[PDB]
Amino acid sequence: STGSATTTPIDSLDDAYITPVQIGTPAQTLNLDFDTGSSDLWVFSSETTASEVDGQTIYTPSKSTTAKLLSGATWSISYGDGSSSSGDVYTDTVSVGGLTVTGQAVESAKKVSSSFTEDSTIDGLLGLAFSTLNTVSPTQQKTFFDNAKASLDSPVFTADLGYHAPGTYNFGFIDTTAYTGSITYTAVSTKQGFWEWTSTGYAVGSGTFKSTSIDGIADTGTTLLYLPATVVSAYWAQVSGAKSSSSVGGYVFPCSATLPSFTFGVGSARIVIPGDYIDFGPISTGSSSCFGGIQSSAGIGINIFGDVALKAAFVVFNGATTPTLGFASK
Template identity: 50%
Template structure:
């Protein structure tokens, strides 16, 4: 039975009682329960559980069991949930255990650094974020540093540790963790996001004097298959699967194309494109697949050809991109990849409202960027395999087995973590620094400079709330509450407080308090 100290109970009671409650309202409860929440999935390892039982009861683990554990570990697989941060799918966050602390990280196939908010930053920069504190098993890599910048001028820098990192049950026991000592304001203001996990090629890692391996490269040899598969979703949580291909997540065949990794990215050549029900136009071009970029950036002739089929669409100089009436039915868009036609539904291409009547397109020009980028607007319609099982890396493309039922105006389901109000795209052109092309976190090019923060009064905020709002990053949830506001306006419930106290009292009494 658990025991409860007087101080602990007083603290718990004090937390529960935000306003006076009459003593007669407190009632002893005979039963209580807590709901468990699953944060990741991984393949069950029977031998590991046997070994765990031996160790728990102080029995030496037989060599045959240790051998079985090692054999099972050599075929590791795991899956982690990727949740949209806001209602426009500007970026997706995944729970990652770094040195014993769970952080919410943006997985980015367009960069190769695993960097995190850390205890070495100023207290003001840490506010609202889950923070990496080097664990007792961490080793500082003396003389090593890192410095990364993004196309909007945002960036971060710091020093380097080797520490344990766990993603969906897949463990890297000595992973390079880049602990931030300073970050730009756009990162600190995005309190949902605690850093970034790069999944490009390790050759573009920014650690000096020697580049470090990405998480994927660190664990690749222990995976059942040397690959990871990405299933991003519109307006709902998707997954990153490591070491296996999940046939339930796609339809038809996977079309594979070779990857050009010479620049450190998952580069490929598309055979052509199609608009709506039209036939494929055989105009090949090179691009990269980047989960850290929100929109799709393509050659001008392709972009112009698409919007020529959109009624009333025009290039808006102030928005640095194509806009159209929000009520417009957009045509689908397809890429020919490995001889197969892969399609994003037209409603996915309606990214965000510019004003009350006009919306911003999810396909824009790559001319000022210097490379074409297939970002989340397209990727969230696909099951994409990032494959290193062959001598030449390759990308696999298949249509997802189901699509989101989200409406075409860019509004996501209630499962998204971010703000519920849409914001107009930034007026300046969202251009990334070509190396690295990482773009997905911090309010830069990945989100097209958009990290909406406004919420209706009394509405709970999942990050990016108004200045001065409190934040509990452990769950990614924060409640905005202005000074002097009533309990109801901040989401506080007197009934809930009473229930919390009753449950705490019952637990204490059950423990012999």
Template identity: 50%
Template sequence: MKVLCFLGFIALVAASPAPIHKRGVYKVERVPNPNYTGRNGPRALLKTLRKYRMPIPDGLMDAVAKADIEMISRRQIGSSRVRRQATNTTGAAALAAAGNTTAGAAATGVGLVTATPEQNDVEYLSPVDIGGQTLNLDFDSGSSDLWVFSSQLSTAATTGHTVYDPNKSQSFALIQGATFSISYGDGSGAAGNVGTDTVNLGGATVTKQAVELATAVSQSFVEDTNNNGLLGLAFSKLNTVKPAQQKTFFDNVMPSLAEPVFTADLKKAAVGSYEFGRVDAAKFTGAMTFVPVNTTQGFWQFTSEKFAVGTGAVQTSVAGSQAIADTGTTLILAEPAVARAYYAQVPNAVNDAQAGGFVFPCNSNLPDLMLDIGGTMAKVSGSDINFAQVDAQNCFGGMQATPANLQIYGDIFFKSNFVAFNGGNSSLGFAPHA
């Protein structure tokens, strides 16, 4: 997601990808997941900092270890918090059902599949068909690799996972010598070889799409048995395949879409979707605002130099400050001036090094936060900023201060806003959810 750590080896150029469905609209729905055992605020913050190569504040590693131990203890005694209304399928069963659910909409040019947010909106997973095999992948607008758990991994690494087996696909072709190696924020990563295959995302289909087959994955991915890989939706210049970068699924499928866009409708505790090919006006209120995106670094990046707390006056944080819209990040990392001003309006909120960041009493009535998106203000609901419980009284803030000159707006931003990514003119659109 990020300024990624790119490790490369040797590869050859893949055959030109070929989209095979023309002028379509394709939708990937998400549903709530009740298989929820609690969030880890310090770990979510650490993941984002590492993902973007940002400095790690003193004390954060200790806070992560402490939160890990407390979460394990809560799970062992059967304690679970913040259970939300959901469907009657749970956990792996819900994901399995998602992988088998498609709408018979081929005749109308609309594809539909379900998608399930893991750990209650911490990570969004969607079923993707690769060479006739369905895997649940994490859609990430902050990275540009499509990699999967493959049959080349050891049994120990794949236990509980659905794996992609190139030998079971009639359309797979190996790119001789091509490799990928990618590292994400929490130190997690994957590496392996590369081929091409037909990739179908709810009806949006590309033949000869680069698919990166993991031969090594980090332990955190091994333990996350719901997730079988990532589908990157940033710009292709971030792709890690060597020696020749490969195009993302979105770049390849754009010519076949009714409009060169995809949208993220990631509302909290309600059915949402990723949709390719249109901006559905029924999903938002008012007029959608589009702002230009700076693609220099390969991200969906824009200026964000102003903010407001609740109904207060608009303030300037840092002139020229930049931010990234990242569906693969959970938290919001904002300029320190924004974080300080926001939590100053929350009674008894403190920046607690032992907890890893800003914390506040869990029963706080949090104000809304207004963020500058390319010159227009967007609201983040205060209720979404109450992210995770730290102890019996205190909660960890879903908005923290960035230690670098870059702001990251993750899923907490998306929960309040319907967002459109326009690849045709490199712009980002947003409006409040309907």
């Protein structure tokens, strides 16, 4: 089997991407944030504290003839950005882009943090990291991809995120028309539950390439590109007037600037992030100071190849017995 679904930016900055997901019988369609950095499929629901729902579409399990309460199961997750959510668990039928899993754990939120309440466009998350990170207790549950994998034509999914435009998540096949050149595959460590890999270095604009190992994660659920302080300083030094602002929480730059590109290495291959992809707009409405899309990982503990990086590539999440990642230009 295969599935194919369009993923759409939630706003004009590409702050996140939502993908429609069918849950239950009859189907209830929710727009979920596909997150290769976590492993829970959770949704706003009829159980979510009313004051914490502000425009999201909810899953109502009592209206699904295939929903079953998973007895005694609860979940609670805290994300790297400080967001969180928790609740109880159903199993139900879940379909993405024509690919169906029966008996998928659907984690129904009773509580969500304010950042989720305030994002009316995100109805929940669909985790695509390794199932060792799933938070359901006392019996850990599998991700949608792990449940689908054996049925798929090939045990893979691909992320093709757009810049200011829709893109695609495919399951079970590699669309050879969606990229240019070849796909370069690179080793993955699953020891932390992430799609963790080692970039071979970087360049800023037309500058020479610096060969240096950068361990980090491929994370579709993180907006920005978080890299070591040395790398990020080298980037922003090429932008007149850019500075790290403690009050704003990262590098900012004059909105009148034209930003240089940023290149990262995948083996001997090179993925070029155009400068415009690094512009996250005014720090507050009407400001002429703009927020940068490349930020230091120093306070995070891991480097993160988030959407800024991934949307410059066609990315293969290869779930073979030994997982690997593939990157192609597009």
